[PDB]
Amino acid sequence: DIQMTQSPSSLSASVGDTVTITCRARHGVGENLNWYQQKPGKAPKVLIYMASSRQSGIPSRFRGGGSGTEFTLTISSLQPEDFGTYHCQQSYSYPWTFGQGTKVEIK
Amino acid sequence: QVQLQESGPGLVRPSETLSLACGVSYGSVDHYYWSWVRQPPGKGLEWIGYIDGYDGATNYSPSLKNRVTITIDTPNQFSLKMTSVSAADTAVYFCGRWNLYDDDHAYKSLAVWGRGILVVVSS
Amino acid sequence: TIIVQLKESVEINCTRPNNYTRKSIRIGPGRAFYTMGEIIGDIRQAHCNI
Amino acid sequence: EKLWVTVYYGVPVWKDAETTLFCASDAKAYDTEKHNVWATHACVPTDPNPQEVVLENVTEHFNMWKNNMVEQMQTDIISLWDQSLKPCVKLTPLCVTLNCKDVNATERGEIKNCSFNITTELRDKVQKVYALFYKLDVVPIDNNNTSYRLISCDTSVITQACPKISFEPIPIHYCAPAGFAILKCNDKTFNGKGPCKNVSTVQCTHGIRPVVSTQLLLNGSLAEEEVVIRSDNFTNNAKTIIVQLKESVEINCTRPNNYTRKSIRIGPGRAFYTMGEIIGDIRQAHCNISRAKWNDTLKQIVIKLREQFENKTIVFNHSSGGDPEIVMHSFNCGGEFFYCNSTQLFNSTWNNTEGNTITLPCRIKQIINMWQRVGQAMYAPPIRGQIRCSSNITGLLLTRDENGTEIFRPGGGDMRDNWRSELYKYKVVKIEPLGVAPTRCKRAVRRGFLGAAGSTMGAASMTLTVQARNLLSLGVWGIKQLQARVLAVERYLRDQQLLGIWGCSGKLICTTAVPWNASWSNKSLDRIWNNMTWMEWEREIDNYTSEIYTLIEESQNQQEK
Amino acid sequence: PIDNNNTSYRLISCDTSVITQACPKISFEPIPIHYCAPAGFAILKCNDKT
Amino acid sequence: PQEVVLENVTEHFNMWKNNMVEQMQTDIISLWDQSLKPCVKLTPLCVTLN
Amino acid sequence: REIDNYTSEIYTLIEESQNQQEKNEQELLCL
Amino acid sequence: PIDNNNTSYRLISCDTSVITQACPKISFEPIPIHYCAPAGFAILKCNDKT
Ligand SMILES: *[C@@H]1O[C@H](CO)[C@@H](O[C@@H]2O[C@H](CO)[C@@H](O[C@@H]3O[C@H](CO)[C@@H](O)[C@H](O[C@H]4O[C@H](CO)[C@@H](O)[C@H](O)[C@@H]4O[C@H]4O[C@H](CO)[C@@H](O)[C@H](O)[C@@H]4O)[C@@H]3O)[C@H](O)[C@H]2NC(C)=O)[C@H](O)[C@H]1NC(C)=O
Ligand SMILES: *[C@@H]1O[C@H](CO)[C@@H](O[C@@H]2O[C@H](CO)[C@@H](O[C@@H]3O[C@H](CO[C@H]4O[C@H](CO)[C@@H](O)[C@H](O)[C@@H]4O)[C@@H](O)[C@H](O[C@H]4O[C@H](CO)[C@@H](O)[C@H](O)[C@@H]4O)[C@@H]3O)[C@H](O)[C@H]2NC(C)=O)[C@H](O)[C@H]1NC(C)=O
Ligand SMILES: *[C@@H]1O[C@H](CO)[C@@H](O[C@@H]2O[C@H](CO)[C@@H](O[C@@H]3O[C@H](CO)[C@@H](O)[C@H](O[C@H]4O[C@H](CO)[C@@H](O)[C@H](O)[C@@H]4O)[C@@H]3O)[C@H](O)[C@H]2NC(C)=O)[C@H](O)[C@H]1NC(C)=O
Ligand SMILES: *[C@@H]1O[C@H](CO)[C@@H](O[C@@H]2O[C@H](CO)[C@@H](O)[C@H](O)[C@H]2NC(C)=O)[C@H](O)[C@H]1NC(C)=O
Ligand SMILES: *[C@@H]1O[C@H](CO)[C@@H](O[C@@H]2O[C@H](CO)[C@@H](O)[C@H](O)[C@H]2NC(C)=O)[C@H](O)[C@H]1NC(C)=O
Ligand SMILES: *[C@@H]1O[C@H](CO)[C@@H](O)[C@H](O)[C@H]1NC(C)=O
Ligand SMILES: *[C@@H]1O[C@H](CO)[C@@H](O)[C@H](O)[C@H]1NC(C)=O
Ligand SMILES: *[C@@H]1O[C@H](CO)[C@@H](O)[C@H](O)[C@H]1NC(C)=O
Ligand SMILES: *[C@@H]1O[C@H](CO)[C@@H](O)[C@H](O)[C@H]1NC(C)=O
Ligand SMILES: *[C@@H]1O[C@H](CO)[C@@H](O)[C@H](O)[C@H]1NC(C)=O
Ligand SMILES: *[C@@H]1O[C@H](CO)[C@@H](O)[C@H](O)[C@H]1NC(C)=O
Ligand SMILES: *[C@@H]1O[C@H](CO)[C@@H](O)[C@H](O)[C@H]1NC(C)=O
Ligand SMILES: *[C@@H]1O[C@H](CO)[C@@H](O)[C@H](O)[C@H]1NC(C)=O
Ligand SMILES: *[C@@H]1O[C@H](CO)[C@@H](O)[C@H](O)[C@H]1NC(C)=O
Ligand SMILES: *[C@@H]1O[C@H](CO)[C@@H](O)[C@H](O)[C@H]1NC(C)=O
Ligand SMILES: *[C@@H]1O[C@H](CO)[C@@H](O)[C@H](O)[C@H]1NC(C)=O
Ligand SMILES: *[C@@H]1O[C@H](CO)[C@@H](O)[C@H](O)[C@H]1NC(C)=O
Ligand SMILES: *[C@@H]1O[C@H](CO)[C@@H](O)[C@H](O)[C@H]1NC(C)=O
Ligand SMILES: *[C@@H]1O[C@H](CO)[C@@H](O)[C@H](O)[C@H]1NC(C)=O
Ligand SMILES: *[C@@H]1O[C@H](CO)[C@@H](O)[C@H](O)[C@H]1NC(C)=O
């Protein structure tokens, strides 16, 4: 039961800038961290698989990276549709826990 | 493109058993880890547990292990039975498919999600 | 072999109208065979329009 | 008063760079039976003369948290481990249901006696055998009866380590290839990030023991003056706090049981080595830490943390409950893999004597998922005999998590955090010996390599040969070494080709016909040849460097010929 | 032989090694091999009769 | 073959520490393993023989 | 073999005194 | 069809080789590839329209 902390807990940015979201595991987990995008009222969509790789259909603007305890999601050229709550997940050890998530608003 | 849809009662009493079904539309319950994840209002996601498809073996989160039974009742549907609910269990419950075969795109990530059913525990 | 290079291209629209579904049959730890399960909809011939 | 550009070959100027490094070992350090997992037989024997040239007037910014040497060492350790385990027995026939009975000591079922039905080398014969397994290696299947399965067999293929492959750490030296150098920070109490005043140049580093352990660093090296708290930001508790100790604390770990080694033949050419019978009684594996020494170690750590974190109360907690591979202290010694609860070491509040020894309980696990990776697993074969570890505690990895207090816990991230503890003093730099400076003409104590780096341009120009001499000279290390040699040759040959075009291939210093443009640097020769170092000079004309070379090719030989 | 005086046998060394069949197309005829030093090195030959 | 006789050169030869022999053995073993590698394994053949 | 104990000394002298000084004396003599 | 029986069938390639499954993550979409001269060589291009 690895506890996850995400930072910042509340995020806002203008259209077109580059933003980062940091996910921290209480224990080292190698590269086994997923990232999901949850739009309000909808189920989450998978964005990043093993820390850095992308899902087909997801534009190259969503880049992952990191290993061990520090993982980041970088969203370049942020678009209006990229609004909602981002979650990180630990695939390394069961239970596959999640962070509380960071809300991203469009200004 | 396989899709999943949760079905069940919206309200359960504080001492009854919660029974939620998940149907599969454009597909069937094949050899993936079929699982349930909880989202309490205002909180992040919590894993409930998964059941395999190759065999009937299941694996539940330890903190809920003694309160959760998951079985498959038909090739196009499986269900979560969570006993002894409490007020703390009010949440949106999501059904999903955990992909574990490496040669696909999700080496270990819930890759097919449902829409989510809101279950409220109240008197 | 006679290689013919055209001045203008010809548009070819090829379609596989059948949808199908995909099922995983496990072969061993961490590995599976991916095959078709049940066909959804009518059976229609794949074809190309020139 | 007119100045002309002069080309100097052998300039002691270097820049931060990443490159592939090679390994060296002290002597063979093997008996031809150990076949060390780190492939030390393929490393170049070390040079008995370590060089070590102290650079006067050189202050260099070091950053242990962005050091490429750590990422490269971690990559090399993973690659070597995978290459070593690859040609070994794959335990695919063992994904069977185990019928396990608890072993009753004369623990609570820590060792289980599991019987199962597998094939023999003859394939058409099926044998019933039994073996002893640790509780952590067997997971219940279906209901709560005696049926068990191996912890990872369902998702990955467990590879049995070849019994001839030793896991004993032997110090490994990371030398840089020709054309590159390693700078070492010799400050007694280096913060881990920032300028270092006492900088030395050494082609190789000291021996580093590739010890795989968590929470507490074993062996390695100690601090010279005091306990040093490194970390990165400190305010951000997400970063790992690396603590280097001044004095070692002796830790005596042991496994007292005397198991047999039963070889069960699995298939043609393949055998499974497992635990057979238990000789003597069953006693718990454990680890002894002197209480007073640990007490003073924490006293020093709390003092340093209090200084860093202001006068707050420091409270040490143990790790959260969970899978032993994640939350327990772990190490490998004697060939055996130990996991210890490590809860008696971080259980105190320091604010502002029951026993003299801390005995930690430990467990043995044979199926190990190392490097925080899934999809592959190793089975650790039985060693036979009692294990004596007798290791040194030389450092800690602490993490941090509200009534005016701060909570620290044993922890850390991936193995890179351990390598930083040894690699915090080293930086890799690329040598660029070719520099240009104005002179008046138209067309010593034998300091070691880069010893003139902190000197003025004058007098430093009298040591060009010293830097010039160091531009030259099928597994993981073989191909990487061949690539490094070819790339060093290409770099040297490219510099020689540039000099040949300029007509300076036979000259260390050559004067060209290109006048000095005052827009490049409106400075007199006294302002250039004195006061400035070659590093500062190359920085000042870095944005104009490409222009100077163009003029040399555009003029001089292009017209002189 | 296995199973004492029974007619059961196994192939030799099966229990200790993985037997690889030599490809029938592979010839074992010895062909003289000359060893040559890399450029920059040399081989000295002793011509003393005894 | 060239072959240059070295006048006035007396040299010390020692066959028992000659690296050329170890190098030849390594090459011979590597060649056998290379040749046998792309061939049929007889693992299924380890059966009880009557 | 006789010079094998002084070879590094001779090489150190030749480069140091013959090519880093010839190249400075020539640099100064042009004037 | 592997027998006179009109309900027996086998994979087309089974009888000659083991069939390797393509990983679904692998995309077969063609991507432009450029060939570049190595050092020591040059690539000439003919620009004659016809
Ligand atoms: C000659 O050139 C033409 C023009 O470029 C080529 O025609 C294009 O062909 C590609 C496919 O080869 C096609 O791209 C698809 O368009 C669909 C339109 O909706 C998309 O839905 C589809 O997306 C899927 O594939 C992408 C490939 O990476 C994924 O990124 C994406 O997430 C989708 O993934 C689905 O499919 C993959 C299959 O591998 C699967 O793994 C996933 O799980 C998921 O099911 C593609 O983007 C272009 O649209 C065509 N162009 C036009 C203008 O129509 C033509 O093919 C070339 N000739 C030849 C012989 O190849
Ligand atoms: C690291 O950095 C320091 C600080 O910059 C350098 O120290 C300077 O070094 C230069 C070169 O040696 C010094 O300049 C010389 O100073 C001499 C005076 O010092 C002498 O006399 C005192 C008397 O008290 C003695 O104590 C002392 O030891 C010296 O013997 C001058 O005599 C020199 O001039 C002569 O030589 C120059 C050579 O170019 C000629 O041009 C002159 O005509 C004349 O013959 C010269 O000025 C400088 O003073 C030092 N600075 C400081 C602050 O100490 C280190 O050298 C440098 N280290 C390295 C390895 O680069
Ligand atoms: C930190 O460094 C210390 C040393 O300073 C190190 O402790 C050493 O560990 C090694 C192995 O872990 C010990 O070596 C063993 O010593 C016994 C003594 O009898 C030998 O029998 C052992 O031989 C085994 O392996 C052989 C080869 O396979 C077998 O033939 C044999 O039967 C045995 O299985 C082996 O040599 C060494 O003695 C200790 N040193 C001391 C002083 O006790 C410690 O392990 C290092 N820390 C870590 C975490 O590695
Ligand atoms: C292919 O054959 C299988 C079995 O022969 C069919 O699966 C059956 O589908 C019916 C649909 O009503 C079910 O009631 C049966 O229980 C299924 N049987 C089995 C064994 O799975 C499948 O539908 C056929 N598919 C096609 C496209 O013809
Ligand atoms: C583990 O179980 C096996 C049986 O599966 C035990 O083996 C038998 O042990 C008894 C008493 O030691 C012997 O009389 C039998 O001859 C053994 N049978 C075989 C087939 O070897 C084994 O002793 C148990 N081991 C432990 C440590 O409890
Ligand atoms: C396949 O599915 C699509 C979904 O839009 C549908 O339009 C199409 O008709 C289906 N194919 C056939 C052959 O019915
Ligand atoms: C091709 O042409 C036929 C003509 O009947 C039409 O029905 C079909 O839809 C066309 N296919 C596509 C892919 O446009
Ligand atoms: C398999 O092992 C069990 C013991 O767990 C034994 O009772 C059973 O007979 C074995 N099966 C065969 C076919 O020998
Ligand atoms: C710098 O480090 C070297 C390492 O040998 C040491 O001898 C020297 O005294 C140190 N100098 C200072 C000023 O710390
Ligand atoms: C452990 O510490 C003692 C302290 O005296 C020292 O002598 C010994 O060499 C150290 N061992 C290692 C492996 O660092
Ligand atoms: C350290 O962490 C704090 C947390 O608020 C952050 O604001 C600050 O920028 C960080 N500093 C560095 C140097 O990373
Ligand atoms: C362990 O058991 C073996 C069994 O042969 C015995 O020879 C050896 O002395 C035992 N060792 C100890 C330390 O009891
Ligand atoms: C560890 O300390 C305990 C204290 O009771 C002692 O019995 C045991 O023998 C010691 N073990 C070692 C390996 O020194
Ligand atoms: C560890 O064992 C050695 C054996 O010589 C002993 O000297 C040392 O005091 C022991 N240390 C601890 C902490 O038990
Ligand atoms: C260790 O330090 C704590 C600090 O509270 C103290 O209570 C304890 O008595 C000390 N133990 C020893 C053995 O010095
Ligand atoms: C950490 O230690 C404190 C006492 O210092 C204790 O109250 C607290 O519950 C511990 N934390 C956890 C998570 O158990
Ligand atoms: C460590 O020991 C304590 C002693 O109370 C126990 O509660 C805890 O569960 C143990 N933890 C592990 C991970 O074994
Ligand atoms: C921490 O020390 C106290 C001292 O009273 C003890 O009661 C407690 O059990 C210790 N905690 C653990 C986890 O052993
Ligand atoms: C000497 O170097 C310093 C470096 O900051 C610079 O400010 C100063 O102007 C330089 N002096 C000359 C004469 O170039
Ligand atoms: C010496 O060696 C040369 C090698 O060419 C050979 O022809 C000649 O006969 C040798 N003579 C003696 C005396 O061994």
Coordinates of N, CA and C and ligand atoms in Angstrom, one line a residue, chain B residues 26, chain C residues 16-20 39-45, ligand 6:
Chain B
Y26 N -19.1 -4.7 -26.6 CA -18.4 -5.2 -27.8 C -17.2 -6.0 -27.5
Chain C
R16 N -12.3 -2.3 -45.1 CA -12.5 -3.6 -44.5 C -13.8 -3.4 -43.6
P17 N -15.0 -3.5 -44.2 CA -16.2 -3.1 -43.4 C -16.4 -3.8 -42.2
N18 N -15.9 -5.0 -42.0 CA -16.2 -5.8 -40.8 C -15.6 -5.2 -39.6
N19 N -16.3 -5.2 -38.4 CA -15.8 -4.7 -37.2 C -15.0 -5.7 -36.4
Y20 N -15.6 -6.9 -36.1 CA -15.1 -7.9 -35.2 C -14.8 -7.4 -33.8
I39 N -18.2 -11.8 -34.5 CA -18.3 -10.7 -35.5 C -19.6 -9.9 -35.1
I40 N -19.4 -8.6 -35.1 CA -20.5 -7.7 -34.7 C -21.0 -7.0 -36.1
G41 N -22.2 -7.2 -36.3 CA -22.8 -6.7 -37.6 C -22.8 -7.7 -38.7
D42 N -23.1 -7.2 -39.9 CA -23.2 -8.0 -41.1 C -21.8 -8.4 -41.6
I43 N -21.8 -9.4 -42.4 CA -20.6 -9.8 -43.1 C -20.6 -9.2 -44.5
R44 N -19.6 -8.3 -44.7 CA -19.5 -7.5 -45.9 C -18.0 -7.7 -46.4
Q45 N -17.9 -7.8 -47.8 CA -16.6 -8.1 -48.4 C -15.7 -6.9 -48.3
Ligands
LIG6 C1 -18.9 -1.5 -38.2 O1 -19.2 -0.5 -37.2 C2 -19.5 0.8 -37.6 C3 -19.6 1.7 -36.4 O2 -20.0 3.0 -36.9 C4 -20.8 0.7 -38.5 O3 -21.1 1.9 -39.1 C5 -20.5 -0.3 -39.6 O4 -21.7 -0.4 -40.4 C6 -20.2 -1.6 -39.1 N1 -19.9 -2.6 -40.1 C7 -20.8 -3.4 -40.7 C8 -20.3 -4.3 -41.7 O5 -22.0 -3.4 -40.4

